[PDB]
Design a protein around this nucleic acid. Structure first.
Ligand SMILES: [Mg+2]
Ligand SMILES: [Mg+2]
Ligand SMILES: [Zn+2]
Ligand SMILES: [Zn+2]
Ligand SMILES: [Zn+2]
Lengths: 286, 253, 16
RNA sequence: GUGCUCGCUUCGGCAGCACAUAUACUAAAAUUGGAACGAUACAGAGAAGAUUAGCAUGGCCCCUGCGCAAGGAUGACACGCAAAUUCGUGAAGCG
RNA sequence: CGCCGCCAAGGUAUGUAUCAAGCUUACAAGUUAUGUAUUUACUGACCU
């Protein structure tokens, strides 16, 4: 039912080698979600690494901008649930077999035969990105995804091969922390990790820190851009720009709006292509 | 187990009616009764898809389109309502009820110029008299003088009905239109009825001219008699023409 | 957005 | 790794030439969802009296069969929606 | 002058809710009444 020429293949599954050899089939395995006969391709990424043939088909990868074999996004290198939780639009897809699954899957394959270049619904909302998901976007990822799965007979001590067993050895797995939408167990801990980062400890008073020491101005930040980026938060009382240290001083009437600026600018407010420097003001008349 | 019995009742009804629409894909009562059963729940995001896949087997019927349109009109969503009304009226132009109920929903809405764009598209498909004089009554019920005059020039060139020939002379009984009333009466005298008069236009002409003064009322009924129909009149109105001329003048000795 | 984009040509009438 | 050539000065050291990167990687799996059939208990068997030959239509139901034969209880599932005749409400228009 | 050599469907029904092996990837993973012609029913454990 499905033929292909080349799969999606994000970089963490290609391997460390730009020179890999790959064999192909015409009708290979079924997808583990919808059982569609795609074309499984097989290659060797590394010398200590398993083959990682193919998990899903091309069509289900073209719905949500997903790679081919490890089920992560191509645009970041993240799972699907983090992506549509950060963008707050799920682009729903059924769960059963013959109820509504293959119906809308065949129709979305039928309407996407022209382009084959972009996903069906994420083309308009993958543009307003790089704000909340750029904070965890791992460059040069760990190659432990590519290492082979654990073998038996070393857990029981029966392995006659010894060192020439190609899979792994001396790796005790843990039965406490290991599909398409939900639910994923370590991903909940990853959302707890991004919800429990390392900010500055909030001093115990009643919102008196309305000043803020922001610097790194140079020639990109100007006064009108900064006061219009503060104007969407609210109104000023006394603002200034100092150029001997390349810094700006802003305050607010009732602190809370600038408080989310404190949520916005903990090495996080990225305007004009620069990681700005932010530390605390005095708020003490010192 | 209230939720269990509730979902059991709903699941049995949905399964029975989905088997009913699976068996017969032709008669359209089953989909609309199923979808109004979900409309009775008053909070749905799936019944629009039911009406959307129900029109794929039959888009030529009026009932399914008007029922889904009146359902979306009954709710407070107006954007999806316009998004289904416009594709309904561009899918079936020749029916009148979709345009009528959409313009009536716009009667419940404001009088913005998009309504006038809908009405000029409704003029563009060439309907009958029942649409066009309804639209001029629409132009009367908001007191438009210039634009109602503008849209009415294309009215006469399609239907040469005498009921419309006598009502092209309506600015006389609305604005009194004097010099252009003489021009409209020129238009009433040069067109069809060149030798037979259609036995009705000069009656209303002489009626308004008797409502006016004695400018050109002697010429049309007795002195322009070259266009007679074998007696110039029946027996029922000739003495009525005579007494119509007699007792409404200067009455000189 | 929710509503579709309005397509009107440069000189003529509103296109549907 | 292996063979050949004193080719370079010890049979041994060196140098060159030739051969040129397989494997649904496992004997396993913490294992994975487990549909048929059989057993338990229900319901029970088309055609306006009874016993009933059947051949058909449909698609989100299958099985035996090499089937564009055939048979599976007519292989099973097929039910109340009355439409315009009377009246009420609302809308569009005309005198 | 010496045909011809036989299987099966047609019958002991099949639609369900639980309970293993067969097979499958070993992978994505932090108006009472009478008389009579006349039936219809009912009773007596009526009867070879
Ligand atoms: Mg049969
Ligand atoms: Mg049958
Ligand atoms: Zn798939
Ligand atoms: Zn991948
Ligand atoms: Zn081993």
């Amino acid at each position: 039912w499905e033929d292909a020429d080349f799969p999606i293949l994000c970089q963490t599954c290609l391997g460390e080698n730009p020179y890999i050899r790959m064999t192909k089939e015409k009708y290979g395995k079924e997808c583990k979600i919808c059982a569609r006969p795609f074309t499984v391709f097989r290659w060797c990424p590394g010398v200590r690494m398993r083959f990682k043939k193919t998990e899903v088909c091309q069509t289900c990868s073209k719905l949500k901008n997903v790679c081919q074999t490890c089920l992560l996004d191509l645009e970041y290198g993240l799972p699907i649930q983090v992506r549509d939780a950060g963008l707050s639009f799920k682009d729903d897809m059924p769960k059963s077999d013959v109820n509504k699954e293959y119906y809308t899957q065949n129709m979305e394959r039928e309407i996407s035969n022209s382009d084959g270049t972009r996903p069906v619904g994420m083309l308009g909302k993958a543009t307003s990105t790089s704000d909340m998901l750029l904070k965890l976007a791992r460059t040069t990822p760990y190659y432990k995804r590519n290492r082979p799965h654990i073998c038996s007979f070393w857990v029981k001590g029966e392995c006659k091969r010894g060192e020439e067993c190609p899979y792994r050895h001396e790796k005790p797995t843990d039965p406490d922390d290991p599909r398409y939408y939900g639910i994923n167990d370590p991903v909940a801990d990853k959302l707890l990790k991004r919800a429990s980062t390392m900010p500055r400890l909030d001093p115990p008073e009643d919102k008196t820190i309305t000043t803020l020491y922001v610097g790194g101005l140079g020639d990109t930040i100007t006064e009108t851009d900064l006061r219009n980026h503060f104007y969407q938060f609210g109104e000023i009382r006394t603002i200034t720009v100092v150029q001997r240290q390349q810094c700006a001083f802003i305050q607010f009437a009732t602190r809370q709006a600038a408080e989310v600026a404190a949520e916005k600018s903990f090495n996080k407010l990225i305007v004009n292509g620069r990681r700005l420097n932010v530390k605390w003001g005095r708020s003490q008349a010192a | 187990t209230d939720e269990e019995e509730l979902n059991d009742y709903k699941l049995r009804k949905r399964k029975t009616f989905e088997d009913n629409i699976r068996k017969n894909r032709t008669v359209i009562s089953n989909w609309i009764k199923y979808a109004q059963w979900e409309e009775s729940l008053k909070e749905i995001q799936r019944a629009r898809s039911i009406y959307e896949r129900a029109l794929d087997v039959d888009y030529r019927n009026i009932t399914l389109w008007l029922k889904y349109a009146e359902m979306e009109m009954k709710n407070r969503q107006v954007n999806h309502a316009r998004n289904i009304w416009d594709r309904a009226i561009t899918t079936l132009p020749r029916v009148n009820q979709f345009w009528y109920k959409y313009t009536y929903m716009e009667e419940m809405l404001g009088n913005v110029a998009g309504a006038r764009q809908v009405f000029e598209r409704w003029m563009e498909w060439q309907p009958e008299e029942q649409a066009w004089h309804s639209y001029i009554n629409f132009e009367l019920r908001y007191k438009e003088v210039d634009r109602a005059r503008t849209i009415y020039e294309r009215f006469v060139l399609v239907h040469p009905d005498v009921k419309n020939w006598i009502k092209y002379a309506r600015f006389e009984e609305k604005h009194a239109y004097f010099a252009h009333a003489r021009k409209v009466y020129e238009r009433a005298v040069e067109f069809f009825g060149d030798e037979h008069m259609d036995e009705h236009l000069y009656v209303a002409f002489a009626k308004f001219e008797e409502n006016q003064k004695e400018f050109e009322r002697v010429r049309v009924i007795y002195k322009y008699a070259l266009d007679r129909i074998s007696k110039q009149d029946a027996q029922e109105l000739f003495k009525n023409y005579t007494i119509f001329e007699k007792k409404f003048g200067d009455r000189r000795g | 957005s929710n509503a579709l984009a309005i397509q009107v040509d440069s000189e003529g009438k509103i296109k549907y």
